[PDB]
Amino acid sequence: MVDAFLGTWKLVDSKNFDDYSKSLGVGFATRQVASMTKPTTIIEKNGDILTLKTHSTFKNTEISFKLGVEFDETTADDRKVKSIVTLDGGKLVHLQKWDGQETTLVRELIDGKLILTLTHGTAVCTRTYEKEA
Ligand SMILES: CCCCCCCCCCCCCCCC(=O)O
């Protein structure tokens, strides 16, 4: 059941995003702009296919995928990764693999807010999104 994740979401809090992006090898200037950017994430479904848009004044991305089926992805920071998204414990878990590395993007609804936890290396970033009507 992915349905409570669907809709338009706006970033309202961020913790440790610089640590996360730095761990991925993102350069200082991009990290600087990212620290002041508040994306909008739009999650939509059509049958078995989810589409996840991330929009901002800096970078935009869009992916479409079926839960549990690997897909190719080119991330906002230009990594070419092998990805899979599943539901696990009611959380939407996105795993990216490239060059033997991994990162996870885990989304979980808590009190109506969408909490995105990003882990790479030892870095753990928590970002909070609120629903927009
Ligand atoms: C959409 C603006 C992002 C700007 C950051 C660019 C370099 C870091 C990108 C890291 C991977 C994507 C992180 C997504 C974060 C999110 O959806 O809130």
PDB file of all heavy atoms in Angstrom, residues 6 11 15-16 20 26-27 30 33 41 43-44 48 53-54 57 59 64 69 81 90 94 102-103 117:
ATOM      1  N   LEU A   6       1.309   9.316  -1.654  1.00  0.00           N
ATOM      2  CA  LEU A   6       1.043  10.020  -2.879  1.00  0.00           C
ATOM      3  C   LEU A   6       0.708  11.468  -2.628  1.00  0.00           C
ATOM      4  O   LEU A   6       0.068  11.813  -1.617  1.00  0.00           O
ATOM      5  CB  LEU A   6      -0.089   9.340  -3.641  1.00  0.00           C
ATOM      6  CG  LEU A   6       0.125   7.853  -3.946  1.00  0.00           C
ATOM      7  CD1 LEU A   6      -1.092   7.290  -4.676  1.00  0.00           C
ATOM      8  CD2 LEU A   6       1.431   7.660  -4.776  1.00  0.00           C
ATOM      9  N   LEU A  11       9.630  20.573   1.329  1.00  0.00           N
ATOM     10  CA  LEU A  11      10.639  20.411   2.396  1.00  0.00           C
ATOM     11  C   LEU A  11      10.438  21.485   3.450  1.00  0.00           C
ATOM     12  O   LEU A  11      10.427  22.689   3.140  1.00  0.00           O
ATOM     13  CB  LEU A  11      12.026  20.564   1.794  1.00  0.00           C
ATOM     14  CG  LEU A  11      13.158  20.331   2.802  1.00  0.00           C
ATOM     15  CD1 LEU A  11      13.340  18.838   3.099  1.00  0.00           C
ATOM     16  CD2 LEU A  11      14.465  20.955   2.340  1.00  0.00           C
ATOM     17  N   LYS A  15      18.255  17.975   8.235  1.00  0.00           N
ATOM     18  CA  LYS A  15      19.365  17.738   9.143  1.00  0.00           C
ATOM     19  C   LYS A  15      20.418  16.904   8.442  1.00  0.00           C
ATOM     20  O   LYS A  15      20.112  15.832   7.908  1.00  0.00           O
ATOM     21  CB  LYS A  15      18.888  17.004  10.400  1.00  0.00           C
ATOM     22  CG  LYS A  15      17.864  17.826  11.197  1.00  0.00           C
ATOM     23  CD  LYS A  15      17.431  17.079  12.460  1.00  0.00           C
ATOM     24  CE  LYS A  15      16.521  17.935  13.346  1.00  0.00           C
ATOM     25  NZ  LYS A  15      15.157  18.010  12.835  1.00  0.00           N
ATOM     26  N   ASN A  16      21.669  17.391   8.443  1.00  0.00           N
ATOM     27  CA  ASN A  16      22.828  16.656   7.966  1.00  0.00           C
ATOM     28  C   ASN A  16      22.855  16.428   6.451  1.00  0.00           C
ATOM     29  O   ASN A  16      23.558  15.527   5.980  1.00  0.00           O
ATOM     30  CB  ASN A  16      23.033  15.341   8.684  1.00  0.00           C
ATOM     31  CG  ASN A  16      23.334  15.451  10.122  1.00  0.00           C
ATOM     32  OD1 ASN A  16      23.620  16.517  10.667  1.00  0.00           O
ATOM     33  ND2 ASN A  16      23.339  14.275  10.757  1.00  0.00           N
ATOM     34  N   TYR A  20      25.653  14.210   4.069  1.00  0.00           N
ATOM     35  CA  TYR A  20      25.268  13.195   3.095  1.00  0.00           C
ATOM     36  C   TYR A  20      25.825  13.487   1.715  1.00  0.00           C
ATOM     37  O   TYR A  20      26.454  12.624   1.086  1.00  0.00           O
ATOM     38  CB  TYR A  20      23.742  13.080   3.094  1.00  0.00           C
ATOM     39  CG  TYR A  20      23.228  12.102   2.082  1.00  0.00           C
ATOM     40  CD1 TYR A  20      23.307  10.731   2.308  1.00  0.00           C
ATOM     41  CD2 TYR A  20      22.675  12.545   0.877  1.00  0.00           C
ATOM     42  CE1 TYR A  20      22.854   9.827   1.358  1.00  0.00           C
ATOM     43  CE2 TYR A  20      22.217  11.630  -0.074  1.00  0.00           C
ATOM     44  CZ  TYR A  20      22.303  10.272   0.169  1.00  0.00           C
ATOM     45  OH  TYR A  20      21.840   9.396  -0.777  1.00  0.00           O
ATOM     46  N   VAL A  26      29.835  15.257  -3.613  1.00  0.00           N
ATOM     47  CA  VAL A  26      29.330  16.482  -4.190  1.00  0.00           C
ATOM     48  C   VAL A  26      30.213  17.667  -3.800  1.00  0.00           C
ATOM     49  O   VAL A  26      30.618  17.788  -2.643  1.00  0.00           O
ATOM     50  CB  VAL A  26      27.881  16.718  -3.743  1.00  0.00           C
ATOM     51  CG1 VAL A  26      27.330  18.013  -4.282  1.00  0.00           C
ATOM     52  CG2 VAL A  26      26.975  15.527  -4.152  1.00  0.00           C
ATOM     53  N   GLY A  27      30.513  18.520  -4.769  1.00  0.00           N
ATOM     54  CA  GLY A  27      31.411  19.641  -4.526  1.00  0.00           C
ATOM     55  C   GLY A  27      30.822  20.754  -3.693  1.00  0.00           C
ATOM     56  O   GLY A  27      29.591  20.876  -3.571  1.00  0.00           O
ATOM     57  N   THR A  30      27.895  23.156  -5.065  1.00  0.00           N
ATOM     58  CA  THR A  30      26.597  22.484  -5.123  1.00  0.00           C
ATOM     59  C   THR A  30      26.019  22.272  -3.735  1.00  0.00           C
ATOM     60  O   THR A  30      24.821  22.491  -3.512  1.00  0.00           O
ATOM     61  CB  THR A  30      26.716  21.177  -5.922  1.00  0.00           C
ATOM     62  OG1 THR A  30      27.026  21.524  -7.281  1.00  0.00           O
ATOM     63  CG2 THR A  30      25.422  20.402  -5.908  1.00  0.00           C
ATOM     64  N   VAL A  33      24.498  25.647  -2.518  1.00  0.00           N
ATOM     65  CA  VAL A  33      23.167  25.953  -3.037  1.00  0.00           C
ATOM     66  C   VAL A  33      22.140  24.989  -2.440  1.00  0.00           C
ATOM     67  O   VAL A  33      21.022  25.389  -2.051  1.00  0.00           O
ATOM     68  CB  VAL A  33      23.152  25.919  -4.567  1.00  0.00           C
ATOM     69  CG1 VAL A  33      21.744  26.220  -5.076  1.00  0.00           C
ATOM     70  CG2 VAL A  33      24.139  26.935  -5.121  1.00  0.00           C
ATOM     71  N   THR A  41       8.489  17.536  -3.739  1.00  0.00           N
ATOM     72  CA  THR A  41       8.473  16.160  -4.226  1.00  0.00           C
ATOM     73  C   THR A  41       7.027  15.793  -4.534  1.00  0.00           C
ATOM     74  O   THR A  41       6.139  15.999  -3.708  1.00  0.00           O
ATOM     75  CB  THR A  41       9.053  15.232  -3.161  1.00  0.00           C
ATOM     76  OG1 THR A  41      10.393  15.613  -2.847  1.00  0.00           O
ATOM     77  CG2 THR A  41       8.990  13.780  -3.579  1.00  0.00           C
ATOM     78  N   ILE A  43       4.657  12.607  -5.811  1.00  0.00           N
ATOM     79  CA  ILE A  43       4.617  11.158  -5.960  1.00  0.00           C
ATOM     80  C   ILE A  43       3.243  10.806  -6.520  1.00  0.00           C
ATOM     81  O   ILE A  43       2.216  11.153  -5.907  1.00  0.00           O
ATOM     82  CB  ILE A  43       4.909  10.409  -4.634  1.00  0.00           C
ATOM     83  CG1 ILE A  43       6.161  10.985  -3.961  1.00  0.00           C
ATOM     84  CG2 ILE A  43       5.020   8.934  -4.928  1.00  0.00           C
ATOM     85  CD1 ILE A  43       6.551  10.285  -2.658  1.00  0.00           C
ATOM     86  N   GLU A  44       3.219  10.159  -7.677  1.00  0.00           N
ATOM     87  CA  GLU A  44       1.968   9.806  -8.323  1.00  0.00           C
ATOM     88  C   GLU A  44       2.015   8.352  -8.730  1.00  0.00           C
ATOM     89  O   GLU A  44       3.094   7.801  -8.997  1.00  0.00           O
ATOM     90  CB  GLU A  44       1.713  10.725  -9.526  1.00  0.00           C
ATOM     91  CG  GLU A  44       1.345  12.151  -9.113  1.00  0.00           C
ATOM     92  CD  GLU A  44       1.252  13.095 -10.274  1.00  0.00           C
ATOM     93  OE1 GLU A  44       2.289  13.429 -10.867  1.00  0.00           O
ATOM     94  OE2 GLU A  44       0.126  13.563 -10.537  1.00  0.00           O
ATOM     95  N   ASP A  48       0.585  -0.022 -11.473  1.00  0.00           N
ATOM     96  CA  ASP A  48       1.781  -0.486 -10.788  1.00  0.00           C
ATOM     97  C   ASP A  48       2.969   0.448 -10.921  1.00  0.00           C
ATOM     98  O   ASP A  48       4.030   0.153 -10.398  1.00  0.00           O
ATOM     99  CB  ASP A  48       2.180  -1.888 -11.297  1.00  0.00           C
ATOM    100  CG  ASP A  48       1.072  -2.908 -11.131  1.00  0.00           C
ATOM    101  OD1 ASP A  48       0.163  -2.671 -10.303  1.00  0.00           O
ATOM    102  OD2 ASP A  48       1.120  -3.961 -11.831  1.00  0.00           O
ATOM    103  N   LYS A  53       8.753  12.897  -8.763  1.00  0.00           N
ATOM    104  CA  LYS A  53       9.361  14.123  -9.258  1.00  0.00           C
ATOM    105  C   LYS A  53       9.955  14.886  -8.104  1.00  0.00           C
ATOM    106  O   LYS A  53       9.319  14.975  -7.044  1.00  0.00           O
ATOM    107  CB  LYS A  53       8.294  14.999  -9.921  1.00  0.00           C
ATOM    108  CG  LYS A  53       7.602  14.384 -11.114  1.00  0.00           C
ATOM    109  CD  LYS A  53       6.490  15.324 -11.635  1.00  0.00           C
ATOM    110  CE  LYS A  53       5.820  14.783 -12.892  1.00  0.00           C
ATOM    111  NZ  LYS A  53       4.907  15.838 -13.492  1.00  0.00           N
ATOM    112  N   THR A  54      11.145  15.455  -8.293  1.00  0.00           N
ATOM    113  CA  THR A  54      11.727  16.363  -7.306  1.00  0.00           C
ATOM    114  C   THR A  54      12.036  17.650  -8.043  1.00  0.00           C
ATOM    115  O   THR A  54      12.819  17.644  -9.000  1.00  0.00           O
ATOM    116  CB  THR A  54      12.998  15.768  -6.667  1.00  0.00           C
ATOM    117  OG1 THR A  54      12.721  14.431  -6.193  1.00  0.00           O
ATOM    118  CG2 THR A  54      13.441  16.614  -5.501  1.00  0.00           C
ATOM    119  N   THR A  57      14.415  25.175  -7.490  1.00  0.00           N
ATOM    120  CA  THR A  57      15.092  26.254  -8.169  1.00  0.00           C
ATOM    121  C   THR A  57      16.497  25.891  -8.654  1.00  0.00           C
ATOM    122  O   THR A  57      17.119  26.685  -9.336  1.00  0.00           O
ATOM    123  CB  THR A  57      15.165  27.504  -7.290  1.00  0.00           C
ATOM    124  OG1 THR A  57      15.724  27.147  -6.010  1.00  0.00           O
ATOM    125  CG2 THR A  57      13.770  28.108  -7.111  1.00  0.00           C
ATOM    126  N   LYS A  59      18.013  22.035  -9.023  1.00  0.00           N
ATOM    127  CA  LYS A  59      18.004  20.762  -9.806  1.00  0.00           C
ATOM    128  C   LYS A  59      16.560  20.239  -9.834  1.00  0.00           C
ATOM    129  O   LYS A  59      15.829  20.374  -8.849  1.00  0.00           O
ATOM    130  CB  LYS A  59      18.868  19.698  -9.096  1.00  0.00           C
ATOM    131  CG  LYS A  59      20.338  20.081  -8.829  1.00  0.00           C
ATOM    132  CD  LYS A  59      21.134  20.007 -10.105  1.00  0.00           C
ATOM    133  CE  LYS A  59      22.613  20.246  -9.884  1.00  0.00           C
ATOM    134  NZ  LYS A  59      23.334  20.271 -11.209  1.00  0.00           N
ATOM    135  N   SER A  64      10.489   7.017 -12.857  1.00  0.00           N
ATOM    136  CA  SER A  64       9.345   6.129 -12.831  1.00  0.00           C
ATOM    137  C   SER A  64       9.821   4.711 -12.602  1.00  0.00           C
ATOM    138  O   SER A  64      10.871   4.304 -13.132  1.00  0.00           O
ATOM    139  CB  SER A  64       8.514   6.170 -14.119  1.00  0.00           C
ATOM    140  OG  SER A  64       7.846   7.410 -14.288  1.00  0.00           O
ATOM    141  N   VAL A  69      11.147  -3.857  -8.821  1.00  0.00           N
ATOM    142  CA  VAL A  69      11.771  -4.116 -10.112  1.00  0.00           C
ATOM    143  C   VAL A  69      12.904  -3.103 -10.307  1.00  0.00           C
ATOM    144  O   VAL A  69      12.689  -1.886 -10.241  1.00  0.00           O
ATOM    145  CB  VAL A  69      10.739  -4.023 -11.265  1.00  0.00           C
ATOM    146  CG1 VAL A  69      11.403  -4.267 -12.584  1.00  0.00           C
ATOM    147  CG2 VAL A  69       9.597  -5.006 -11.026  1.00  0.00           C
ATOM    148  N   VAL A  81      23.219   4.911 -11.466  1.00  0.00           N
ATOM    149  CA  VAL A  81      23.014   3.890 -10.445  1.00  0.00           C
ATOM    150  C   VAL A  81      21.986   2.846 -10.896  1.00  0.00           C
ATOM    151  O   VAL A  81      21.171   3.096 -11.804  1.00  0.00           O
ATOM    152  CB  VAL A  81      22.609   4.524  -9.099  1.00  0.00           C
ATOM    153  CG1 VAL A  81      23.577   5.625  -8.688  1.00  0.00           C
ATOM    154  CG2 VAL A  81      21.185   5.086  -9.147  1.00  0.00           C
ATOM    155  N   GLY A  90       6.063  -0.749   5.925  1.00  0.00           N
ATOM    156  CA  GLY A  90       5.288   0.445   5.610  1.00  0.00           C
ATOM    157  C   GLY A  90       6.099   1.641   5.134  1.00  0.00           C
ATOM    158  O   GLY A  90       5.515   2.705   4.890  1.00  0.00           O
ATOM    159  N   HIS A  94      14.233   3.009  -1.011  1.00  0.00           N
ATOM    160  CA  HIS A  94      14.909   3.153  -2.319  1.00  0.00           C
ATOM    161  C   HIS A  94      16.388   2.877  -2.102  1.00  0.00           C
ATOM    162  O   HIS A  94      17.052   3.590  -1.347  1.00  0.00           O
ATOM    163  CB  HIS A  94      14.628   4.558  -2.839  1.00  0.00           C
ATOM    164  CG  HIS A  94      15.225   4.884  -4.163  1.00  0.00           C
ATOM    165  ND1 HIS A  94      14.980   6.093  -4.730  1.00  0.00           N
ATOM    166  CD2 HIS A  94      16.045   4.184  -5.010  1.00  0.00           C
ATOM    167  CE1 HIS A  94      15.601   6.116  -5.902  1.00  0.00           C
ATOM    168  NE2 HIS A  94      16.275   4.984  -6.082  1.00  0.00           N
ATOM    169  N   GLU A 102      26.651   1.820  -2.078  1.00  0.00           N
ATOM    170  CA  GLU A 102      25.220   1.831  -1.911  1.00  0.00           C
ATOM    171  C   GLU A 102      24.809   3.086  -1.150  1.00  0.00           C
ATOM    172  O   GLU A 102      25.545   3.580  -0.289  1.00  0.00           O
ATOM    173  CB  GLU A 102      24.732   0.598  -1.144  1.00  0.00           C
ATOM    174  CG  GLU A 102      25.028  -0.679  -1.866  1.00  0.00           C
ATOM    175  CD  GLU A 102      24.438  -1.905  -1.170  1.00  0.00           C
ATOM    176  OE1 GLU A 102      24.053  -1.828   0.015  1.00  0.00           O
ATOM    177  OE2 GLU A 102      24.450  -2.969  -1.784  1.00  0.00           O
ATOM    178  N   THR A 103      23.580   3.547  -1.418  1.00  0.00           N
ATOM    179  CA  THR A 103      22.932   4.511  -0.561  1.00  0.00           C
ATOM    180  C   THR A 103      21.469   4.153  -0.485  1.00  0.00           C
ATOM    181  O   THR A 103      20.891   3.643  -1.447  1.00  0.00           O
ATOM    182  CB  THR A 103      23.200   5.953  -1.045  1.00  0.00           C
ATOM    183  OG1 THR A 103      22.647   6.886  -0.124  1.00  0.00           O
ATOM    184  CG2 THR A 103      22.578   6.277  -2.392  1.00  0.00           C
ATOM    185  N   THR A 117      14.942   9.646   5.119  1.00  0.00           N
ATOM    186  CA  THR A 117      16.241   9.405   5.721  1.00  0.00           C
ATOM    187  C   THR A 117      17.197   8.898   4.646  1.00  0.00           C
ATOM    188  O   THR A 117      16.926   7.895   3.967  1.00  0.00           O
ATOM    189  CB  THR A 117      16.139   8.353   6.851  1.00  0.00           C
ATOM    190  OG1 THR A 117      15.216   8.831   7.831  1.00  0.00           O
ATOM    191  CG2 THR A 117      17.488   8.138   7.526  1.00  0.00           C
TER     192      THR A 117
END
